[PDB]
């Protein structure tokens, strides 16, 4: 009898043209109800707790299972959890999952890579103040017109950010680093010396 308030609350957001998903306007309302910027990290966290497949929509099962898992039948209970969830992102292993989730969440379904502009936007979001070289990294990619970002390069950039020194000296010129990261270093090394 707990699903009662939850089913009703789902009906608030469901796409009129598809009962099995929360659509564009529904996502806009859901965010509006939470008093959050749709594009905020806080919304991203919620989707990550929902285990959402693709940005800008939730399946009827993504919403119900997710809210159920957090034990929330309202939008205030959800809000009350935000910080406890946002803090949840201190754990290194928990943040990695979130970070890697961001890739598959952000990209188009059925395509292997992530478009550059979306990747930058999502990097700014998740990796802001985690990465000393973010600004230079995005610029690097924009200037050379790499149109797409592979999963391998996305996932490993995290590890790169964790271990790279202010002067990049500890970076081994051999490495097991994906080409794109290595190119960045060979570009970025002069700019810091």
């Amino acid at each position: 009898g707990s699903k009662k308030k939850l089913e009703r609350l789902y009906g608030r957001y469901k796409d009129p043209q598809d009962e099995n998903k929360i659509g564009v306007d529904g996502i806009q309302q859901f965010c509006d109800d939470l008093s959050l910027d749709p594009a905020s990290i806080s919304v991203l966290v919620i989707a990550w707790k929902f285990r959402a497949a693709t940005q800008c929509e939730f399946s009827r099962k993504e919403f119900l299972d997710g809210m159920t898992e957090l034990g929330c039948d309202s939008m205030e209970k959800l809000k009350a959890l935000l910080p406890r969830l946002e803090q949840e992102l201190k754990d290194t292993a928990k943040f990695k999952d979130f970070y890697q989730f961001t890739f598959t969440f952000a990209k188009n379904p059925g395509q292997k890579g992530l478009d550059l502009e979306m990747a930058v936007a999502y990097w700014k979001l998740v990796l802001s103040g985690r990465f000393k070289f973010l600004d230079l990294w995005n610029t690097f990619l924009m200037e050379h017109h790499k149109r797409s970002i592979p999963r391998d390069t996305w996932n490993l950039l995290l590890d790169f950010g964790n271990m790279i020194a202010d002067d990049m000296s500890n970076y081994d010129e051999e490495g097991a680093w994906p080409v794109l990261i290595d190119d960045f270093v060979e570009y970025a090394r002069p700019v810091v010396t």
């Binding site: 965010c31 749709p38 594009a39 800008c56 979306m118 999502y122």
Partner: peptide
């Protein structure tokens, strides 16, 4: 939901 603005202006 970065793409939500573009997807609203497109629908």
């Amino acid at each position: 939901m970065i793409k939500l603005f573009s997807l609203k202006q497109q629908k």
